[model samples]
Target: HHMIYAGVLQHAYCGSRKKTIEHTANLLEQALKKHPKTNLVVLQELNPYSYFCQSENPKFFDLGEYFEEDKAFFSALAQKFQVVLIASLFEKRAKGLYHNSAVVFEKDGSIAGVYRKMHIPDDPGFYEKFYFTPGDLGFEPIITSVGKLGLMVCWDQWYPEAARIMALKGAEILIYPSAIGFLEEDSNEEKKRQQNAWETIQRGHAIANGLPLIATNRVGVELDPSGAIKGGITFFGSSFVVGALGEFLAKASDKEEILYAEIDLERTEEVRRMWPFLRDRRIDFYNDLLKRYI
Candidate 1:
């Protein structure tokens, strides 16, 4: 019904939890004031990536302890400001069970919804699978007062199945809270290619699903304390918002900044009706997706 403007936390790095939460709260406060029209502000991967991977049984962190810690921070923020906030966090699902998850806060300071990251990346520097369990929560939109947000974390954006399913379930927009970057060990060409691949793939999802796409990525370079990994990943910011037709509205630089853009909710239905990609789908013959080898 109304236009949605999304504010992104481009890249934020902090050495400690207090600093991280403080920075996030500050960013949210400033962004909401700066763009009064902003409906949703997405914080990029909110995890102590440094500490978790270093420990054996990385999910050993106390959930109740962390819930109390983060809940106090986020809940207070939501109450102080009436704006909707999407935050990704390292969640303790249970004892020895954790999930990289995104928590949504509604206007009333209650949990609008929660989405656990479906894709668990185990690549070189991103040893996420070691610590967090793959999400049991299936791909579905987190219905909010603003809209139905098809929220996914970093690695989940790569899969079309996740996006399409959310679209089919009536998601108004797709949002990805991401943390990705280049390993310093890669050649210049490889780094460029990897970055392009990351951006392009999401655009493809927008085109395929006939819905608006928004991705907020971490900007700065973060290195492990022990430096076990050869080179730290250079998180290229380049946060962006695209329309249902895959039109690039605004994109932020690789620097730390609040990237903002307005999205007309009606455009999604108009675009989908014109394209009819969803209507033309062959749902009957897609059972092969379930098979390990079809």
Candidate 2:
């Protein structure tokens, strides 16, 4: 009965670095102060920064420059609370090299590991491919004091292959620091369809992998810096946590909030024993999956 209390901070970026980190700090304090049992906490994608990928202006490249500062800030926060924290950061490897990454901070405030976002999405308002170099980290889970965190970013959630590979590599739980939203011009039906697909796909991953899952999404509207859209991207904060069988442990609303869940790590073994999806996988027949088209 290895029960782990987890929390996801689902809040909007306050447009700048200092203000956003302060707000995140306040929220983190609130989440832990209220839910003292929480041992692990996950933040949304690109925390402390407004979603700047709406346009490809080179000026936006500067956001990744604060890599060291961002890391230190989160590390300090982790030390203060002695909490295992999963933090999102825009990584600046060099002048031309950058990647969207998640850094896991151990309970002692030391870096557990870093997982770079593998899949880069480029569609409509989400222009991530221009700024981020797809991760070279593969599907390795970050080993932390709390558990084996299968950390993936926003676009990576839609792919089951990524989840399966993580599970195969001994991930205990899947965590996604995501930023997905709807444009103002999108029809009501379109919004519903997109939201449903996003949630359903992740739930499928939880069930298929027989592992607990955590998804934290940003909230509020971040305008397109290029003024391409007047209403901008409305990031719906439907952050949630689920059990190994996809049972909801906690779920957030479309507002700034903290989602808390208690997961028993052993449940994965029990769930896997029943479903046996991994056990029945016909690995020898999946060679064609490597090809562009089957």
Candidate 3:
């Protein structure tokens, strides 16, 4: 819905504020009304705050009100619009703790499960670890009414360990709600390289895990009014859905668009059995993974 709601709109802003959820909910309802047959909805990055807001005043943008309302609203929406809602949330765990969280709501309006982000990046534009606690939930697939969903946040998408754990837990498909893009000051060549690397890594996850992949990334260039960096992140909005064979089933370009596609869960079983990499694992000697270095 990110593409259809925020992508196509003229004034779509991302932040942890209540207004963003309110606005997104409105767009999603409208989209559902237009396409009543829609059964599942995958949204992009939940929070779009500046580096200062995310890293510093984490509690300044609380989602308790929005989440309460969303829980209720999504329940009603399930009856009127869709069956499943894959929603991302910036959770305020306590007075100081927080998490980059994602929750899947079933058709019954109850939460199917929640996943906290494991990998936290502290890059120039993305200062995630300063705000979010590293996920303690482990790499477990959310066993929803639809299927086993291996859901990971932005930075976690780069880690193969995240996908492997989910796959081991019988994940039928991997989903990533990502917020990645280019810095405005980057050269054209660097921009191309970054985008390619981002795309290649996610596709590689699907190929390695033997599961279909759906990745949703935020769109548009959001400038830092505070001018923390020389230039802001140019969010390239190329969201995509890949097949079990790691082929692009559907893809959105740099423009704002909702690229909708479907995958058959049975394909995962077929692929896994044919490849059987899971069965060939040497679990006995892999204890070295815990050390700081090999």
Q: What is the TM-score of each candidate against the true structure?
A: 0.94, 0.98, 0.87
Error of 3 at 66 (Å): 4.4
lDDT of 2 by residue, 1-294 (tens): 677799889888886799999999999999999999999989999998988887878888888779999999999999998899999999998889899999999988899999889999998788889999999979999888778888899899999999999999999999999998999889999999999899889999999999999999999988987888789999999999888998888889999998899899998988999999998999999898789895
Off by over 4 Å in 2: none
> Which numbered prediction scores highest in lDDT against the true structure?
2
lDDT of 3 by residue, 143-241 (tens): 766777888887888888888888888887888887777887799999999888988998998988788888887776676655776567777878888
Measured with C-alpha atoms, the lDDT of residue 7 in candidate 1 is 84
- How would you encode candidate 1's per-residue C-alpha lDDT over 1-294 as one tens digit per residue? 767778886656776677777887788888888988877788777643333442234334653247556855786787677767887777776777778878998877789888999988776666777877899979989888889999998889899999999999988889998887777678889988988898888898899988889998877767665567765667888888888888898888999888898888888778888999988899899988998794
lDDT of 1: 0.79
Best of the two (1, 3) by lDDT: 1
lDDT of 3: 0.71
How does model 3 score by TM-score? 0.87
Clashing pairs in 2: none
The clash tally of candidate 2 reads 0
